[PDB]
Design a binder for this molecule. Structure first.
Ligand code: JDP
Ligand code: JDP
Ligand code: JDP
Lengths: 222, 222, 222
């Protein structure tokens, strides 16, 4: 949307320098993120170091480590007039170090929920955009049926339907179109990896920081 | 079946680089696994590092270490169009790090049960394929008798029968054929190393990830 | 179905004699259950005493108490030729004392799952059998939409729709028919009291006692 460059740093690249005690690697990451103006810096599974160290308690130490410290130092020294942007992604925000969320570094926190009915059709069609889809196979109804399903759950449904279609095509040689029955049968092994307790614990975090109470009704004098 | 090359990495080779802090060894493993296209990469007792560190809890840290991190990094960077394939083997999947089982790396999990009656005959005949077997020695009945027996249990039964036959042949000098009595007597010291609690705990893991409930009966409108 | 009498003993009646140290009350319960031949004896929330004492561990004692002991004594002394029948109901079977499940008393254990699509229509129509239901209000679709919903979840949906209809009827005086909009709007506050972890923990109990392994394929000689 911003016509900006994109740099992705997954968990293994972040945890490699933690184990290796070689911490000059973030230097070039932030250097090449700023020369490609405008760019966007994306940190995947930022909680990887916290999980590797234990998480909320772990050892006698807190939630502060060296790699996140280097990221904090590099982010503090950046120029606001540049168009470089840092995006952090995590699934466990309770073990994220509080100092990275301080105002001025990552003060903006937004919650990514489960895909809704409108967004699930997009996940199904993204998976099936390379496959022969029959006319009778209605993705709107399939997305309506699954409600608490994650993108991964729909992904494995599509993969299992494709596997069934491929197997039927192979065994039928001794049809080049995914049929309604393939999706109907593969719908039986429908998992739901995200539990309700997880949604509750993410919400407790969400309106932990919402706090829209107290000053809800204000009237100015004149 | 695929006419592909095979590379086996046992537990000691994986745990040697963990203790030695020398982690360039996975680099050449994955390099020589990909140049021999088509190949299959097999990791034996992947939980060796987790057992050496403690397992489910162990120290204050979680289930993430450096060697599994290197394997994750190498697997993430591979090309899907190549025919290289990675197979992980473990006996304790509860202590396996969750990140290696993420979709895209080792999402496919299949359970290897105890050999059934048809498969136990194969284990017996594989062990006895180099030994003189008498006609009256019926392996079908022997495999039928042992039910909750592992391949190792049948292996030691065959080894003990061979030991008894060799000892009788040596002492009789002062017959070059394994007799029915050798197997009948060696059948007395029949162990069963796998307990029922183990089977129960493996199943709890199995339909932990099965979840074939909820969407079992679906009817399309038209 | 058996044209038999029915006696229901809820949790409070069972826990009253536990606190009151007055344990002759089960005597008349079992006496009047057997004189009304044929009858059926139903014990609701049998785990109430275990919950009141702590459950799996609780105090230094085990899972045995006095009231369940009296029920065991009364059940052991009954005549099998009589048509009296005892049914125990519980939601936590992990804290149920093992001795009540011994063969001869309550050896038969069956699992009551969440209602399926066919059974959910019955729950909706049982709740709405006394209310004016509009023609366009399709209960089949409503039951299809809710999948992991308990009978209580559908019950509160129906109650909330009735409350909305009653409120609109009262405020409109200053219509005597539940409309499609009443159910559509009340569908927004749809709870799901039973979590997936609960279903998993009930299943672990279920094929704890299933054990259909080992002797799955048997062939007789002749
Ligand atoms: C293959 C695919 C897998 C996947 C997964 C997953 N855990 O497998 C999760 C989220 C999106 C996913 N996609 C996906 N991939 C794409 C698109 C798309 N739809 C938009 C969207 C994005 C985030 C959210 C909702 C819906 N979804 C759209 O076009 C590009 C590719
Ligand atoms: C000596 C031998 C020991 C052993 C053991 C063991 N813990 O001792 C476990 C599993 C298979 C084993 N084998 C074995 N070895 C072989 C074969 C064979 N049968 C097929 C099979 C494979 C896996 C499973 C079932 C049955 N079994 C077949 O031909 C090659 C050698
Ligand atoms: C008001 C009512 C509430 C309720 C609840 C609840 N937690 O509110 C749970 C289960 C059944 C319930 N019913 C109910 N009540 C009735 C019926 C019926 N349908 C059959 C049925 C039974 C058990 C199971 C499924 C479906 N369901 C049938 O006619 C008699 C009354």
């Amino acid at each position: 949307e911003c016509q900006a460059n994109f740099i992705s740093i997954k968990g293994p690249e972040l945890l490699t320098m933690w184990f290796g005690e070689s911490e000059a690697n973030v230097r070039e990451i932030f250097d090449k993120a700023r020369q490609a103006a405008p760019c966007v810096l994306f940190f995947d599974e930022l909680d990887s170091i916290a999980k590797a160290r234990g998480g909320n308690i772990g050892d006698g130490g807190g939630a502060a480590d060296r790699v996140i410290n280097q990221i904090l130092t590099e982010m503090d020294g950046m120029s606001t007039k540049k168009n470089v942007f840092i995006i952090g992604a995590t699934n466990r925000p309770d073990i994220i170090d509080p100092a990275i969320l301080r105002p001025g570094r990552l003060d903006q926190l937004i919650y990514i929920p489960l895909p809704d009915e409108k967004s699930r059709v997009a996940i199904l069609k993204a998976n099936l955009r390379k496959s022969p889809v029959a006319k009778d196979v209605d993705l709107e109804f399939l997305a309506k049926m699954t409600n608490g399903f994650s993108g991964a759950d729909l992904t494995e449904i599509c993969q299992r339907a494709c596997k069934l279609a491929i197997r039927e095509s192979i065994e039928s040689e001794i049809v080049p179109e995914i049929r309604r029955d393939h999706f109907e049968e593969a719908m039986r092994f429908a998992r739901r990896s995200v539990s309700d307790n997880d949604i509750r614990k993410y919400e407790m975090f969400a309106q932990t920081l919402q706090q829209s109470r107290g000053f809800g009704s204000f009237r100015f004098p004149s």
